[PDB]
């Protein structure tokens, strides 16, 4: 173990030989790559490199692999110093993980000439001209199916609607089959959320045709027929960021609903007792003021009834303040999750 | 007093012998633990450790016990350097206090085989299976007592309700007695907020039975019977964080209510004078426009009356702006208290 | 000019003799205070002080008086190093100004035994027991004058009110005269905002008595009689911070009112044209929809009228969004001014 | 290549001669400007300058022109060190770009005695007295044209209005011609937004006079006549910052409108199905509840209809929460753009 002296443009660093040996792939590790940088007269190695960066590089050998960037060094300057010292794609990967950019995954392609083209056209719209044609045709078909849903339920009408709906269902099933049979890995296809959305978009038409050519459940089927709005999430990137935000924030949504429940029970109980002694008062139960407290705490302020007494108006003043306080507390965490996933794109 | 030279991997530090002596428990303090690190030829001590950390360590001896972490050193790296220099569990405790993590308290257990099990089951639900059974049974009993309270006050009914209410009161009193008689220290039991909540949850049933088997006060007793919602704070951690937030923020709540009072008196006075010259106007007093200014400043915007003149609509425009300004000022302090107590958990 | 070497615990600094001379009051400046710190064998001065602090201290001599604190040095540690080097109360004052704590003013006292006591009791309530008695009596008299103002304007009444009002005016004029005749400097008395508030609080009673014992102007006098709420700003510290916030933020309030004006003209013009072709529509002019756009943009959402057409409901949707955007823009600057003046107290 | 030693007040830096040569204009680059700073006995250059700044200066030569300011150095101190080392107006410009102050543009003037005065008076109001007179006359003429627009559409009137409107149009066309014929570069005149606003402000009067002296299109012309509000953006600086904010934030406005569309379709579909089984319910279609969901999600809370069932009130509670969440997400990005462009002025 012999102490070795390294000069980084004036800033001298001294370490024992054993510390450098631990890693051989490094410029310092191999005795013939660093041998050139050595100077015989002063028994020192001279590197005209950046002084702050070397202190971090030296601690990598001392810590057996820990890598950090000094808060006073830009990421790019540190990255080029790491490349110069030849720490390795593994140390560089650790540094990248510390920065917080682990999204290096690259999704595969089908292993054939024909299949790759079919998957590329449907999955990748940025490639060709026909790909953008398929994208615009798909968005237009989704939009006219939404229009058909709402116009179906108008009362002037309640057949062209069945023909337009069956053409939309033919297009949905066609692109689902083409997407399925041209996918590199079938094992991944029943784990994407969007393919499940496409399956739920085409199911209730087929079960209605089946049981109709073979009341509350029919209401359930009619309600399920609204999940065709979420087929726009394949073509919209803000909606995918909204889904990531809502998944990451499930504890805060439960706290929002729980705090609003506690406040609704409390202020409904309080308002009824004050108004119970006035005949003009509209509140007749505690279940009754539940609506009044929801719209007063949220500030929609419809007003199921207007308080008629003095204690009822003091309770209403406190309800209007307490809702602002209650709602404003778990919402900055959800908007921080949104800002994170949204500016992650840059 | 002889100057002693310490080399931290190249970065040389010089101090007098007296400074090291002040603390003997340290590696530098005792003359035989540091003696090995000494090198005779250069009359220097060599440590292959992190250079930024040592400057902070040296100032600990110079300052007679002050310990700080340099803004450019991660907490973990500084913590391991502190352990290496053997400063002590006292210096380490001072460093931890500076970081802001003083919650190291560990609450005791009953000194017996039987008592410890009873306290553990009721106090600690994460232990066993019966503990989670007691937790789920307790939350269900609290929820059906809330449902019984509101259904009691419905007008179609006004006995099964007395039987369900007396079963709920039997369960509440049973677990309160079991919690009390199995507690390591009785002196702490009348200082927890939750045990006071359980006592107030079971009192008015017993005083109603007493004076009923022996009007405004009866109204007070009926209102008190709503504090059974706060028995959910033992099973909910967001509600405990909400109570800590509301205790820490009592000056800001008083400022919110005071600013709203000042604005209500001011804008009620202003609107009445403008509408006094119009017969169609609904405002008849200044006490009268108090409600109109509360719901206009908070934005619930019910509208006790609609202003009928031009000056009354200019005053209403200013009221709607001034409420947003007034309310928005003390609320970021309350949401910062919430974020602090909420992310303290991680 | 001879180079002089200073060692700060290992970290060597070299400067010419002329640089140290520029300031003589410093420990380095005088040749007999620093002479002791000098060591003859190494021709160096040794100081066991903090290394980062000295670099800032040296630049003070080089820059002819500039003083800064390194971002990596706590204010207290730098302050004690400044005191050790004896830079002076002037350099220390410059450092304090850089930190941003210029509020060192100390307001005087009357130059007599009798006057000082009278000024101290009225101006300073934290001194004695009678001082807190005067404070509580003053707040109670202000509160009953507010109650008399609103009860005067009730319609069941419209004399005990004149007697209570004249007792309140006697107390206000009494403490104003006692405050005036016991003030160290009369030149400052007609520049405080609170003494002007007290004068405007007692004026309209005296001019009403004068012209009544000697219609729109009477309305003006009645409106002026509401400035007795602002007499609570002497006893409330949140109201003084609110006044400082509102003075510092006058450009942002003008921008808020200007943006709301622009939006009201724009959306009133747009809604009327869409509803002009429908007889059922309530909008009849552009002046008419001014109220509807104010309450839709602010979200009070009273609704002067409900849009009856499809274009009118598209315009109403855009009005409801645009008001949130317009109002939310200049308000974070006002809440930053509030947070600054409010946490300035600590 | 010979190593050269530079001492910055004790802090020694060593570099090879070739690195200094790369830039000759620098004090170090030329062999006769730096020759004076050299000291023969120690073979070192001595500079009593700031030690942190030099490390950044040295990396400029090593990196072939990269310039950065250390996070621990104030901008002014670094700027004066850059000037001392004579790096150049090019290196200084790179440093300024890194700081983020690229607005150094200086707009020209007409090349004649007469033209320069005419352009200066109209373009620059801060120069003279007549310039402020032209500014105040212009703002007054714009304000009375807005008043004439709204009073035209009152129903008591529907000629003095044509005379006032034609005087306003004469003034607008006069200052547009004077601004045009006195402009240094005509190529820039059809690219300013404000000159396009002035042209659209004077067009529909002339096309109405032309086709009237030669129904939906007439409605379009009447609507276009509202763009005279935007002629105030020349005299208002908050409105110019609002236009810059709205241009920089076009993706966030599209996301706001898209999220509100998705929520309106979803909650309209949900509320109708719950209320379809109740005759008292007002919702009759899904197109019908579109208004109800817009005003519930935005909190204006007019209420097209009031839900009459229990499932309809659970859906209404969720709509009132979801609108707050949906709207609150893309709005902090727009207020950050506002704060940036607004505090850019200082
Ligand atoms: K609202
Ligand atoms: K509202
Ligand atoms: K309303």
Residue numbers in the entry:
A (entry chain C), B (entry chain D), C (entry chain A), D (entry chain B): 103 to 260, 293 to 348, 360 to 491
Original paper wording:
The Kv1.3 channel is a voltage-activated potassium (Kv) channel that is abundantly expressed on T cells where it plays an essential role in cell activation. Potassium (K+) ions leave the cell through Kv1.3 which makes the cell membrane more negative (repolarized), and thereby sustains the large driving force for calcium entry that is needed for T cell activation and proliferation. When Kv1 channels experience sustained activation they undergo C-type inactivation, a process that diminishes ion permeation and is thought to involve a conformational change in the selectivity filter that disrupts ion coordination.
We expressed and purified full-length human Kv1.3 and solved the structure using single particle cryo-EM to 2.89 Å with C4 symmetry in 150 mM KCl. The first dilated conformation (D1) shows the apex of the P-loop folded outward relative to the reference structure. The D1 state may be an intermediate between the inactivated state and the conducting state.
